[PDB]
Write a protein that binds this ligand. Structure first.
Ligand SMILES: COc1ccc(CC(=O)N2CCC[C@H](C(N)=O)C2)c(OC)c1
Ligand SMILES: [Zn+2]
Length: 139
């Protein structure tokens, strides 16, 4: 679990969005596993606007942060789950690191701010949904 709170927006994994997120929908994209809802309170977070390929993510299944080197946002095949059929997920960044299904929503940050959120995992891999291209989150 986890979310990004920036301005009057809440960014969550689309597959973990609540009834309230859908009732206050701003934008969603199944191919990216992202959903953004509107909030009444002003949010706590800054979005990175950079090309960093290193950063630190929070891993809930270890209660720890880990440093990672990650690939640039790209189209990656993701196996079928209870949430989606087998498909290519876009704007996904992979890194070697620990992840379990409940780790989705953990934030990845660099020195410039929030880069993205955990969205996939595998045997010693962790995948992050990028948010740096969503310029409208800042206005
Ligand atoms: C072994 O580590 C795992 C195993 C399985 C997963 C879960 C996973 O990847 N998905 C299930 C939820 C929707 C995801 C999507 N973006 O399509 C895909 C994991 O997530 C962090 C770590
Ligand atoms: Zn950066």
């Amino acid at each position: 679990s986890g979310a990004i709170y920036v301005g009057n927006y809440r960014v969550v994994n689309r597959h973990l969005a609540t009834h309230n997120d859908w009732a206050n929908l701003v934008w969603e994209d199944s191919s990216r596993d992202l959903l953004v809802s509107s909030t009444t309170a002003q949010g706590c977070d800054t979005i990175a606007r950079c090309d960093c390929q290193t950063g630190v993510y929070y891993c809930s299944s270890r209660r720890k942060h880990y440093p990672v080197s990650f690939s640039k946002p790209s189209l990656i095949f993701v196996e079928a789950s209870e949430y989606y059929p087998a498909r290519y997920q876009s704007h996904l960044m992979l890194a070697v690191g620990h992840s379990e299904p409940g780790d989705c929503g953990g934030i990845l940050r660099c020195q410039h701010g929030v880069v993205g959120i955990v969205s996939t995992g595998g045997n010693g891999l962790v995948g992050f949904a990028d948010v740096r291209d969503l310029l409208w989150l800042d206005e």
